[PDB]
Design a protein around this ligand. Structure first.
Ligand code: NA
Ligand code: NA
Ligand code: NA
Ligand code: NA
Lengths: 30, 30
């Protein structure tokens, strides 16, 4: 179902955001 | 169902992350 795809998009989006925040933390030494 | 709560937690988490990234962008003038 297309509902599964939207849940997968949310999961992917949260991973991308978490990984961005992680990279920023490593940049500013945190 | 508890499934609804977990989907709500994901949505909330993505909003919190998006808002953090937005605040960081405003800080560094972007
Ligand atoms: Na990903
Ligand atoms: Na992650
Ligand atoms: Na929120
Ligand atoms: Na938002």
């Amino acid at each position: 179902a297309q509902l599964e795809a939207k849940v997968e998009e949310l999961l992917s989006k949260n991973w991308n955001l978490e990984n961005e925040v992680a990279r920023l933390k490593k940049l500013v030494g945190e």
